[PDB]
Amino acid sequence: TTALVCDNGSGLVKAGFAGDDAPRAVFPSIVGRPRHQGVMVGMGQKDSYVGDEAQSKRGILTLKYPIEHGIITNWDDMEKIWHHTFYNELRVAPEEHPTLLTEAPLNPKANREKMTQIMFETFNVPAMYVAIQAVLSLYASGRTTGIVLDSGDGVTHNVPIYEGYALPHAIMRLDLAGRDLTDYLMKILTERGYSFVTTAEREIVRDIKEKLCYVALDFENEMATAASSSSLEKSYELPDGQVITIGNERFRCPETLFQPSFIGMESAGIHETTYNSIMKCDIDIRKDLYANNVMSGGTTMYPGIADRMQKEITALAPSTMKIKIIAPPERKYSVWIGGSILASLSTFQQMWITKQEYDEAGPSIVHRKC
Amino acid sequence: TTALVCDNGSGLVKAGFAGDDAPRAVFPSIVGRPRHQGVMVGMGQKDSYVGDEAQSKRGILTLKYPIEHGIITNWDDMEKIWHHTFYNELRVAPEEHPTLLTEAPLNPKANREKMTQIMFETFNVPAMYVAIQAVLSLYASGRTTGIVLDSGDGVTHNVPIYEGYALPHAIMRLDLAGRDLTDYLMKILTERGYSFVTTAEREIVRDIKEKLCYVALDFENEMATAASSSSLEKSYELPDGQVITIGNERFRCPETLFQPSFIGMESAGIHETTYNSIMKCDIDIRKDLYANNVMSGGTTMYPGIADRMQKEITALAPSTMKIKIIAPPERKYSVWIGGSILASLSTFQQMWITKQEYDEAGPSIVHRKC
Amino acid sequence: TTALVCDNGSGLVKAGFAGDDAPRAVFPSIVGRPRHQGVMVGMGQKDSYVGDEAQSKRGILTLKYPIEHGIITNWDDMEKIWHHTFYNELRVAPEEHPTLLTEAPLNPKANREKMTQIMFETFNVPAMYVAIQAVLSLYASGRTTGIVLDSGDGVTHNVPIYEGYALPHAIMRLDLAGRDLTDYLMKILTERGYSFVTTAEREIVRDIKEKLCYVALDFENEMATAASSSSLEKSYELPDGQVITIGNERFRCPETLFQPSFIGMESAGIHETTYNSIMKCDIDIRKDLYANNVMSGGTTMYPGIADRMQKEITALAPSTMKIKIIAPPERKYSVWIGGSILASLSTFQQMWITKQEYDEAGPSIVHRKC
Amino acid sequence: TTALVCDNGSGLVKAGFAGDDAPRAVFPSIVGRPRHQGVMVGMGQKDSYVGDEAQSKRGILTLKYPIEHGIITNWDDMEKIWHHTFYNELRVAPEEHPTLLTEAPLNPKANREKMTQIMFETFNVPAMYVAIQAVLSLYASGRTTGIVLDSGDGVTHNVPIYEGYALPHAIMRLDLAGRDLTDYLMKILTERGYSFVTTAEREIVRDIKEKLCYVALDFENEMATAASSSSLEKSYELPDGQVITIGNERFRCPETLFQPSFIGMESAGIHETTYNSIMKCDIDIRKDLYANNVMSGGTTMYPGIADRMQKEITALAPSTMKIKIIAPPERKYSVWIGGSILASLSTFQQMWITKQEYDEAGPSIVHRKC
Amino acid sequence: TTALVCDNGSGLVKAGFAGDDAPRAVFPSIVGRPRHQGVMVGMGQKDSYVGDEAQSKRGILTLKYPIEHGIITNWDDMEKIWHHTFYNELRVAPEEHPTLLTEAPLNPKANREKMTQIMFETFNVPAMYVAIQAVLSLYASGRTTGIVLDSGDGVTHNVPIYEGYALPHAIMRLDLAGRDLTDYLMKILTERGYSFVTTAEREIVRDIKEKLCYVALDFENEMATAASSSSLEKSYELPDGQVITIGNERFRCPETLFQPSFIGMESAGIHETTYNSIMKCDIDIRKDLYANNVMSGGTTMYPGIADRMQKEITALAPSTMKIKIIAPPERKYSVWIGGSILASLSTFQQMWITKQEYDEAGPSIVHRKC
Ligand SMILES: Nc1ncnc2c1ncn2[C@@H]1O[C@H](COP(=O)(O)OP(=O)(O)O)[C@@H](O)[C@H]1O
Ligand SMILES: Nc1ncnc2c1ncn2[C@@H]1O[C@H](COP(=O)(O)OP(=O)(O)O)[C@@H](O)[C@H]1O
Ligand SMILES: Nc1ncnc2c1ncn2[C@@H]1O[C@H](COP(=O)(O)OP(=O)(O)O)[C@@H](O)[C@H]1O
Ligand SMILES: Nc1ncnc2c1ncn2[C@@H]1O[C@H](COP(=O)(O)OP(=O)(O)O)[C@@H](O)[C@H]1O
Ligand SMILES: Nc1ncnc2c1ncn2[C@@H]1O[C@H](COP(=O)(O)OP(=O)(O)O)[C@@H](O)[C@H]1O
Ligand SMILES: [Mg+2]
Ligand SMILES: [Mg+2]
Ligand SMILES: [Mg+2]
Ligand SMILES: [Mg+2]
Ligand SMILES: [Mg+2]
């Protein structure tokens, strides 16, 4: 039996089989529930859709992300998303496959415990392991030395690792990801006239963010550039036909990451959380962690940040240490690639949580086995 | 025990049997009472002629539609029309058949209640189920994604259905139909010299509108084209012998549908209530509601309406969207065809409002069962 | 050079000068020809007597109204009547005076066009303006908010006006006026034993009606009262010398106005056309349209109509509403008084249809200038 | 001279003089354009009435609010409304008075820009300041620690303010106000039969809502109470005369505010947007934002709002937190009262936007000066 | 001239007059500045609140401790805290009283130099003296022989003293105090669900630690106890209103002090730094320093450490030596009590650094006078 690696994140579930380098199931993890009066007899109107189905039939559905800020808020639907992923998208009875879930660091223990309990008492997988959603990024990037920076529709990490030796006192978790970027974009668009309120329109705002937003390289100059028109404005055609021209509010949606005094948070940007994470590391380590800031996650796929993070940190690091921002052009999947790599290594077969061990020690065995 | 489907509109009562695709009884719903003095010791002149009887004997009678503007204002003759439809055209036993009445949306609740009470206390049918006259149009056209326009002689109402799920918050009932067009025609004919005042002549005006009126593809240019004489004139030979030539006032009788400012109605034409009923729907829905503008009812059988409708909508829809008016040539009975289809569904035979339920919980069961 | 105004009704043609409150010329618009054989070489035997000249010699002539039911059915005699009105009572030079014709609403456009053609090719008046016969009544009453009611020698029309904005969708024309009341009186008189068949007989019947008919305030009470002989009889003396006593049929003749079933007509009485015209108007209008039921024409001079109409309307109006029928004593000429008023206004002099405009644009200018 | 405070809302223009506590001119902000055919050459027919004039002459005009959902959609008539409310209402040259307009939060920048450009290049006022419509509500209620709910006829927005420091990241704009309540009422009346369609009838429906509609204290209980007849029935007498008995549909018109699932809107009621606006504030601030829920705007003058609101909030707030709702009896004008107070303060006397600054930098000054 | 004794720690400033036994001014040393958007004109919103004034209005402020790890990091705000203490909390003039500051041992010399330079060139006090924060603890305890252990919110340092002769080669300093304990509690709390990030919530975390944390006696036994739930759990009530059950992590927050391998530090616990400080003394001293382990500072006020530090030391010290932990109940204010005892002494009255000596010797006179 081959090992199943499902990067169950807070945005779109990225699941697939081990060994490969591309997940087979990439669908937004939303559970849609109809809200309008349904009047048609012969139709098989399913009472709750999930995934790309509930993404394409939006105009009837009240979408509901079952994971808010990395943690699982609503279980009864995340169970349905796992059901869909296992059966209707991969077609593999989970009783005959190991499982490799993931979990952002610094999350409640109830989350991980109940994830294990569900995966063992509803799907009865033979073995399940949950790795940190940011160590697999290094396992994929091939290194064993770099301050990872996860992101994307959920939380944001900074997990320094010197030589496969994570420093659990310098993981600077921050919940300022694409979801808050979207809830700020759909609030700055209003200043122009376009009003998106529902969830089916929040998805349109997220698509605008995806294929139209870039990170400035000097915000206080891009602003003054946006005074007299330029190549800033770029029309986008909503799924009903009308267009939108967003000139100013396209390098302010992802620049919240570097200035969180916009959406109201206090904690500094993702350029200063990395620096504080490094300054929480030893002196014989900083001088080399400065040289590989391996990125990850969706949110870090802007045509900006991959090259402004370097300037922001060079304005903070000593002028001698060499700064490098490893920006793999596949970082959107680096976490699952790392999961699939780690699940293949033979040295890892001792790491699974066999069903016998869970049965003998209850669900609270993960806190020691992972 | 087969089901009975009778779309008792404001004009022609269209009754028949389920499964089949042609209404058995298609006759106008009028109840005439003789007004003159009958002096004949043998002629058994019954005090009321109903339907085609009163349509054939018009010079002696006082025709009176029982259904005015969708609602029922005179019950003691609609009851007689139902009795006639059952016992003289279908020649059936009502207590041995389920009934499927219809009703335009946004009608008073008292109308539904008294309708079901009559059906359960004057014919004692085992189970009757009413339905919105728009859903049956999609049932007939074999769709689930349309925006209906059923406008038969009493009302007009665009009910947008996306995928089996009606959007009750964005329907546009309009109180202007073939009857108001007939009134406007018998009022615009006096402009030329032909005087029709009585009801037996109003029926002649309606028969003029039916066959000699058409919708101008460009009304403000047709008004100038028909100024200088052309092939615009026609000639309808009245049942008296004298012929009349309705030159210009034949694309002005159906142009009220698009400019209701003619008969004083402040509301918008049937081309703009559709656009508003769409722009009240969701953005992820407008794209494929713009594509299926299923038309129903009689008044939408003018020669040039399925084209001017598309023109007027394209004049105000987003320029990158595809518009298409699904106009099946057999639309005049499309409501009843959809009714016969719906009563012939396996999953539908539970929706009936059985006589047991009415005797158990009173006539107000319909408001919650339909 | 002042202007002229001739309310060319179907009966008495009222003509005069713009500014005075008295039509100089009043005479029945009857044109008659001798029908017997005349053998008197010396006597000045005319060829065709018109107006009062023909009214005063009936036993020899055969009278002919050119304006039947409001429309001009005969042109080569209405032209004679206009010529007589201009060259025997007013004696004016039509080339030196503008004329203000009148017309009832909802009349064929042939009347308008041929009236303009006659006035601009047979009298060469500088400027003619034809106005509706109800707006003039409101002018004469000096109001701006009333529901007019004009009737005489065959026409009846309620034109509701709120503040100069005449509602063109709520006018209620009706051919149930003095001419038809006379035709019913000369047919009910044959019941008692008096025979009137010819046109001189019709004139005698009209003179009977004008001074011996009144509108009953309670039809059934009156029929039950006059069934037992009382003081209801009123002896009239024909010019022959025979005396007749029209006991009962002196309120049954003007009762057709409120029960048009007598002449077989189907349309409602004038007490109900008014209420239907009001219920065709808007809700913010009805409240103060009920309070001005301004009447006009001759047939509204029956000694009991200004109160029976109020009773009948109050019977079917909202109970908390005020119905103040404005029936001034000088209503028989209200149309022409309003004509003289609105022709003597400062800002009206631009409204005329000058001869230049007709010469440059044809006789079809009325349909746009009126 | 003295400053002008004109709370140009989406309903009634509530304008007046600063320092006082009563707006001199409250009148609905509608622009009526007559639609019927106006034929009376005597009247001085003003072609565009505006305000209470166009509210008194409704049966003739086409009422058209120039502000749809807080934003100004039609400028060319809002300019006329400003012209009227200055000259024909307050009789003051605008060039000799400072102006204090208001504007709901989260509105397009174009709105403020064009508002300032009009106020400076059409009336040439010496100085104009525009402030958010909730800060003024706090100024009026005296506090500096509240979470406003100013919701009148077009918008609804909770602006939490802890100590003079607004939290811009926690405003909840919602377009579910009086206008949508009125539309839902004129759509729900059709349950019984009363059919209001035109704008002169939309005004009647609004006048029904604002005096016979109350908010239930337990909606599911009141629905069942209304089954068996009780004091729920109330009679309103239309301006036409006929009365209507709105039995059940009088606590369903304002219950939309707490279940916007009725108009199909997805966003939760105004009882949950307040709670979300608070749960977006800080932990030590919620303690005394839960205690001052200052209410404002028209739509919060229903009888049973200030109690069902508190019930709903205590139903989802911590059981040890004190929930108060400051509902001042003069809350209809509280925004204008706050405006007058604010313009009557020395520390604000320097915060105007003088004509000099606008002339020197253009209309784009407001974005930074307000 | 009476002596002013202000003990500027890194937590709560404890100032007051000499002679007494309780500081008159105890308030957290935090300079807060607003971070939100102030929208008010009347309010006097000061730009930087300092002290417990900046603790009531905590939801608006970015609290910034001006003393990080004993040393003074930011000076422009520490000057403000001194300003507040001297004027708005004691109402004394600085040039009217001798000042007695303090300083933890082994701190940068620039710190003390600029402290004196401020006290003499900004406040211009007559005479100022700065003494170590442990010999004052000994004065307060009334001895001249003891291994002081001062540990409050910042640094932790042992200063062994045999008989008035401090041994400056055994002052084991370690920065693992209350501030690091709070930054570790707000990180161990995340594992349970409660997420505190901002400084305003970090103060709530510190207030949790203050009145809910206790030191275990056998850490492993307590951990094994917390597995099978016991009465360990307590419910603290945030100012939000909700309650938190911190079961396990209430003896893991103050057990970092004895196992610094939790925050990743390497230096031994405070139970072993005292032992190494003693073993750095002489043989004829240890046998008596083992008996006077005078505690001090805030963080030594747990319901734990005393009866646990005694055990941990007896597990290290030789058997026949006698270990006694002098733990007075006022050890929170021990440093200031000792300062007030010292400043009121005769012999000490020659130790002051008068303004005279500082002038003709520079700010570097402290390095010989202290
Ligand atoms: N091409 C892109 N450019 C910028 N942002 C993107 C892009 N694609 C996705 N995103 C953002 O990143 C998120 C996906 O992050 P991802 O790492 O897949 O989440 P998860 O960790 O839950 O799988 C999306 O919600 C979107 O907001
Ligand atoms: N061939 C036709 N062309 C144009 N209009 C027609 C035609 N046939 C019927 N109509 C109009 O349609 C009306 C009948 O519509 P219908 O759908 O039967 O009404 P209902 O829904 O009340 O049954 C008639 O009153 C007539 O005005
Ligand atoms: N005193 C009267 N009482 C009753 N009816 C009268 C009286 N005088 C005239 N009439 C009726 O009024 C009619 C005259 O109306 P007329 O003024 O010609 O109408 P119009 O204004 O359309 O020309 C006559 O035919 C006659 O029947
Ligand atoms: N007495 C009342 N009771 C209930 N609702 C009212 C009352 N008066 C007004 N309203 C509603 O409030 C609206 C007026 O709100 P208002 O705050 O004046 O609007 P604006 O903010 O534009 O001035 C009206 O449209 C009406 O629907
Ligand atoms: N009752 C208490 N229980 C436990 N810890 C406390 C208590 N009171 C204060 N503390 C801790 O001690 C610190 C105060 O120590 P203190 O000696 O006053 O600091 P400083 O040396 O800066 O004056 C606080 O930050 C808090 O973490
Ligand atoms: Mg993640
Ligand atoms: Mg129909
Ligand atoms: Mg007339
Ligand atoms: Mg407002
Ligand atoms: Mg201390």
UniProtKB/Swiss-Prot annotation, chains A, B, C, D, E:
The modification Tele-methylhistidine is found at residue 69. One of its GO terms (molecular function) is ATP binding. Keywords: Acetylation, ATP-binding, Cytoplasm, Cytoskeleton, Hydrolase, Methylation, Muscle protein, Nucleotide-binding, Oxidation. It is an enzyme of class 3 (hydrolase). GO terms for biological process: skeletal muscle fiber development; skeletal muscle thin filament assembly. GO terms for cellular component: actin cytoskeleton; actin filament; stress fiber; striated muscle thin filament. The modification Methionine (R)-sulfoxide is found at residues 40, 43. SUPFAM superfamilies: Actin-like ATPase domain (SSF53067). The modification N6-methyllysine is found at residue 80. The keyword Transmembrane does not apply. Its EC number is 3.6.4.-. Oxidation of Met-40 and Met-43 by MICALs (MICAL1, MICAL2 or MICAL3) to form methionine sulfoxide promotes actin filament depolymerization. MICAL1 and MICAL2 produce the (R)-S-oxide form. The (R)-S-oxide form is reverted by MSRB1 and MSRB2, which promotes actin repolymerization. Monomethylation at Lys-80 (K84me1) regulates actin-myosin interaction and actomyosin-dependent processes. Demethylation by ALKBH4 is required for maintaining actomyosin dynamics supporting normal cleavage furrow ingression during cytokinesis and cell migration. It is found in: Cytoplasm, Cytoskeleton. It catalyses: ATP + H2O = ADP + phosphate + H(+). Pfam families: Actin. In vertebrates 3 main groups of actin isoforms, alpha, beta and gamma have been identified. The alpha actins are found in muscle tissues and are a major constituent of the contractile apparatus. The beta and gamma actins coexist in most cell types as components of the cytoskeleton and as mediators of internal cell motility. Polymerization of globular actin (G-actin) leads to a structural filament (F-actin) in the form of a two-stranded helix. Each actin can bind to 4 others. Actins are highly conserved proteins that are involved in various types of cell motility and are ubiquitously expressed in all eukaryotic cells. Belongs to the actin family. This is Actin, alpha skeletal muscle. It comes from Gallus gallus (Chicken). The gene is ACTA1.
